[PDB]
């Protein structure tokens, strides 16, 4: 298991701009094309990103290649955020990708916000991180796909995510 096979259990692949769970226009693997209401506007930024006039379609090949940029993004947002980056080098393999995904899902913005269970997970104190990480609107929204990522960082296993 690493970081693809698991964002791609937890985002799934859709080759038509479709509405992710917040209304967002997305394609893909998890790849947000705008928040945007505009159909329009969906499509504009997917040409622009495939490079093609696509007709809010794509194929597998292309789903492919901005997963690779999204999740190499979210590497490189982590390793140049003040915040984020301490918390990654403490870390062991399994809970890293716990990190990358959080990231990738919420912007770097987004995860440099949880103050609280960051100093937890640097303290190595797993069981209290898990428990905070529980208390938002992010597990709230997204239960199941929280709760793999919460067990991943209390236990430091793929257990979540193997049968899936
Ligand atoms: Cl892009
Ligand atoms: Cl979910």
Request: glycine share 6%; aromatic share 8%; net charge positive.
């Amino acid at each position: 298991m690493n970081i693809f096979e698991m964002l791609r259990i937890d985002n799934g692949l859709r080759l038509k701009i479709y509405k992710d769970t917040e209304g967002y226009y997305t394609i893909g693997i998890g790849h947000l094309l705008t928040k945007s209401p505009s159909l329009n506007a969906a499509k504009s930024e997917l040409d622009k990103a495939i490079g093609r006039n696509t007709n809010g379609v794509i194929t597998k090949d292309e789903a492919e290649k901005l997963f690779n940029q999204d999740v190499d993004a979210a590497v490189r947002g982590i390793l140049r955020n003040a915040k984020l980056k301490p918390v990654y080098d403490s870390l062991d393999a399994v809970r890293r990708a716990a990190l990358i995904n959080m990231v990738f899902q919420m912007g770097e913005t987004g995860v440099a916000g949880f103050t609280n269970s960051l100093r937890m997970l640097q303290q190595k104190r797993w069981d209290e991180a898990a428990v905070n990480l529980a208390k938002s609107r992010w597990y709230n929204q997204t239960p199941n796909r929280a709760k793999r990522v919460i067990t991943t960082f209390r236990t430091g296993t793929w257990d979540a995510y193997k049968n899936l």
